[PDB]
């Protein structure tokens, strides 16, 4: 029941910088802590075992250490292949437990999202459904808030969000938000709004349309 608290869940960093991931164990676990690495294709590899031993085939930029109950994985100079997921785990007691993981991402300057709202198309309405979609494109940092409103009243049920991976070319993020209602519900209301707010926003970005309008 040992708890491993890994921090931070997201670490922004840059090529060539030194970074240190941390894992605090809720109980003494001695040296029985391993670090794993997970690539985007899903493959996993052990990087370090027993707190500080590098695994075979591990570049020496990777190293691991311990300080009381605080364990740390340190990368001496980040290479592009290193911006992925990392996990600590303990085998001092069973059940074995794993930290919640850390994703390294590339730091870049702030970027405001471009927001677009799309009314359902006529085809979808003939089939009985009504999906309103909003795109929040190319923004940075990844964190952002999105809100749906129907005739001025915030709607939280029926909403589904999806984020792209950090873009390989400009390091921004994009997110799509889709609100799905019965066709009959969509016709009982007139106004629809996607409201985004990001750290770059001085005021929230309001995108909207009226169903009875063209």
């Amino acid at each position: 029941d040992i708890v491993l608290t890994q921090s931070p869940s997201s670490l922004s960093a840059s090529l060539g910088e030194r970074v240190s991931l941390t894992c605090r164990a809720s109980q003494d676990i001695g040296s029985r802590l391993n670090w794993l690495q997970q690539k985007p294709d899903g493959t996993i590899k052990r990087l370090i075992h027993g707190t500080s031993n590098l695994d075979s085939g591990v570049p020496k930029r990777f190293s691991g250490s311990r300080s009381g109950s605080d364990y740390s994985l340190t990368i001496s100079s980040l290479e592009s292949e290193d911006f992925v997921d990392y996990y600590c785990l303990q085998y001092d007691s069973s059940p074995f437990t794993i930290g919640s993981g850390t994703r390294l991402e590339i730091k870049r300057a702030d970027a405001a999202p471009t927001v677009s709202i799309f009314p359902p198309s006529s085809e979808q309405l003939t089939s009985g459904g009504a999906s309103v979609v909003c795109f929040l494109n190319n923004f940075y940092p990844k964190d952002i808030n999105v809100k749906w409103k129907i005739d001025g009243s915030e709607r939280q049920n029926g909403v589904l969000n999806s984020w792209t991976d950090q873009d390989s070319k400009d390091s921004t993020y994009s997110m799509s938000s889709t609100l799905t209602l019965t066709k009959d519900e969509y016709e009982r209301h007139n106004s629809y709004t996607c409201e985004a707010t990001h750290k770059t926003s001085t005021s929230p970005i309001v995108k909207s349309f009226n169903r009875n309008e063209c």
């Binding site: 493959t43 799309f118 979808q124 795109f135």
Partner: protein, 224 residues
């Protein structure tokens, strides 16, 4: 020299069960512990349990006891994990690993859904209004209600690649849904055509959907 090779991806119905395998090689199978792990999409690793092949003794994370059953075949050098009474919370990648998390199998994705193979409905995403000139306009395609993964989305059959990205699919109510975005100069649309091409190999379907301006018009889809 140690290798762990798992079976391929599976599509299973809720309430059914599924057996995953992990063939080991390069070491004496009975001298090491075997582990099974679970990874919900977008989430962290979870420990399921271990099995020691020499006597096939097992110990489980209490959370998975009864849900997962580990077994090992000393002659075949294979460990199996059986998952029972599946529900949607069981869709995940499942990993095999040799002690002490020293070597790893490649993962096996298990998807639970009551759905039959189903081609996507493809719907245009055009702006609701506010055309702005001498700029960029963002259009898109909503690819909805398909099963199983995957789909391939392309724009103008590869001609529009500048400012394109497709969001990862989300499995809701047994079917997947994704959307794709494209950004083009405003001088190029609607004056020039923009079309998304959507391929769904499990159903052998391929569809094109031209994006046209929003208005009060009915039936654009029979003509686009």
């Amino acid at each position: 020299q140690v290798k762990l090779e798992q079976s391929g991806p599976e599509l299973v119905k809720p309430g059914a069960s599924v057996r995953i395998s992990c063939k080991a090689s390069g070491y004496t199978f009975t001298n090491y512990y075997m582990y099974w792990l679970k990874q919900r999409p977008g989430q962290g690793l979870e420990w399921i349990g271990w099995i020691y092949p020499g006597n096939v003794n097992t110990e489980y994370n209490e959370k998975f006891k009864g849900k997962a059953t580990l077994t090992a075949d000393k002659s075949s050098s294979t460990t199996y994990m059986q998952l029972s009474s599946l529900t949607s919370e069981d869709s995940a990648v499942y990993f095999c690993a040799r002690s002490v998390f020293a070597y790893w199998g490649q993962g096996t994705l298990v998807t639970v859904s009551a759905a039959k193979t189903t081609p996507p409905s493809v719907y245009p995403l055009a702006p609701g209004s506010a055309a702005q000139t001498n700029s960029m306009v963002t259009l898109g395609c909503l690819v909805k209600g398909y099963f199983p993964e995957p789909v391939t989305v392309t724009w103008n059959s590869g001609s529009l690649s500048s400012g394109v990205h497709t969001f990862p699919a989300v499995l809701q109510s047994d079917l997947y849904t994704l959307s794709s975005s494209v950004t083009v100069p405003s001088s190029t649309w609607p004056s020039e055509t923009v079309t998304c091409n959507v391929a769904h190999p499990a159903s052998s379907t391929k569809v094109d959907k031209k994006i046209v301006p929003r208005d009060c018009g009915k039936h654009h889809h029979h003509h686009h």
